[PDB]
Design a protein around this nucleic acid. Sequence first.
DNA 1: TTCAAAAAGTCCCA
DNA 2: ATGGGACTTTTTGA
Length: 543
Amino acid sequence: YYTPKIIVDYIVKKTLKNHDIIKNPYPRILDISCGCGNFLLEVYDILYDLFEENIYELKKKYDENYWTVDNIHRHILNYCIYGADIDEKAISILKDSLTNKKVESDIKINLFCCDSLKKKWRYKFDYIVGNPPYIGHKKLEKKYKKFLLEKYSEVYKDKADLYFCFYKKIIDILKQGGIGSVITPRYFLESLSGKDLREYIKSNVNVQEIVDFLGANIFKNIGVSSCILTFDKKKTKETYIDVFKIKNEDICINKFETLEELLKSSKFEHFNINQRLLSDEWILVNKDDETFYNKIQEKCKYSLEDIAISFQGIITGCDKAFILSKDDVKLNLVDDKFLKCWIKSKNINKYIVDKSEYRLIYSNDIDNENTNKRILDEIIGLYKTKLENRRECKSGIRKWYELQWGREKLFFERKKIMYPYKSNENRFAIDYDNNFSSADVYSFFIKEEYLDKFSYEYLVGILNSSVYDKYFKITAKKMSKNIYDYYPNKVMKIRIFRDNNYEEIENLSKQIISILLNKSIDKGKVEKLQIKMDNLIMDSLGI
DNA sequence: TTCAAAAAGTCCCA
DNA sequence: ATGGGACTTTTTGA
Ligand SMILES: N=C(NCCCSC[C@H]1O[C@@H](n2cnc3c(NCCCc4ccccc4)ncnc32)[C@H](O)[C@@H]1O)NCC1CCCCC1
Ligand SMILES: [K+]
Ligand SMILES: [K+]
Ligand SMILES: [K+]
């Protein structure tokens, strides 16, 4: 959880580089989750140089006895550096580190061992920097979540993250005219959960700059995707955001001595976004992509949500109790009426699904424990303890052997389209085989009233096109290197069109499906057909 | 009653 | 041992 030095230096310089120490020699710089002091120790160094280089100007303008080089260390610690953290061992270490910068009478260091989200803050701050804790909805303590939902409701609801609240706290205790700079996960820029947080930021601070590392691995051995947000409360009217979006996610961050060298390089693209034009969604793309995205949005008269019914897959609550290999001998104990075909996200390709290798025991259809005791005793019951610990079993809503969220079978046992929940690219397939799946695969079918306007074959044709792959990724939620979330909260917002190319687009899609399903697959002709279809779609959308 | 979101992902190997 | 690639469960609030 140590922040790389190149990033820490950038964040501290972002807040302090243009501070007028002559005009205000008492800046308050705060790290609200300071830890061992990665940021605060750097703040000390930047401040010490700033005072030392202007010591004679300060001595002349103010108390000439107070402003001496020998007094800089005491002045910084008494008036300038502030830190908070729940870990007292970390605070104890940081207090010694700040004390040892000088090496008389004891100096008072403004370090607080507390919950920053609970501390009564007695004053606001000129500059706030740091790296807050990230805790999601599963890993956050439930008693603590009751407090967040009560006191941080403006940014924390439902599946929100703890670091949303730190954004609220930082914004709230930032002084008028102050600057804040933090590194957090990037997901709030796009996630459904971040909607209220994005609204809070946009309407309370001026966002100066967003550094989006997309799927690059900033923290070694940490599966998180990062961004750096810099914002102020200055009296400003232009309110444009500098956006630095990484171009190559494989870049090593230490290739340059400073992060500014990386941002100005070819490894990053830069563009500006007008904060006044931000909706509840933040479309952070360059001018070419915005033009591309807007062309499609205006041209398409329908969305998938308009024409389709979407649903999440089965959630058994314990897969090992209900999912068996189709060659497992224990399936001889299970009547075939209980057995469903089961696929994973890797089984979804463009246009068609791999033949399934697993079976789901649709245990909800087992009427009672004595009629099918063999299945319960020998297959499902091997995990009875874990099954009984599921929420709906402890409450009695669900029997110990039942699927936790078995949905409705009739939704799955029909022609439908399926796609993986996380993928590098658009993979929408037509399911012909009544496949069931877990929540790693999403499904939709077409509403009856739109069947004469849209066919499954036409839909997988355009949804798998290069145009729609780029189109979806403009606003999709970037998760990790080469992985986007394909979830209904964005997939169902995809807009679709219907025009004179409909018949030829549909016909090419049928050819691709026919080739994909034959014995000797010549994958090459599929690629040529896809190129022809992409041209038709670009012709249709005028790009 | 029952939906769908959530990576400080998880796990393995060369 | 690490960094990078393949692949993705069920807990949870609403
Ligand atoms: N995913 C993670 N990553 C690691 C955090 C790294 S973040 C950097 C600094 O941040 C410091 N830090 C963290 N939280 C706060 C905070 N509010 C309390 C948050 C709510 C809470 C409730 C109950 C238990 C724990 C936490 N206020 C001030 N400092 C804080 C924290 O000590 C750390 O050195 N989990 C770890 C989780 C386990 C218990 C201790 C740390 C939290
Ligand atoms: K003087
Ligand atoms: K990453
Ligand atoms: K992990």
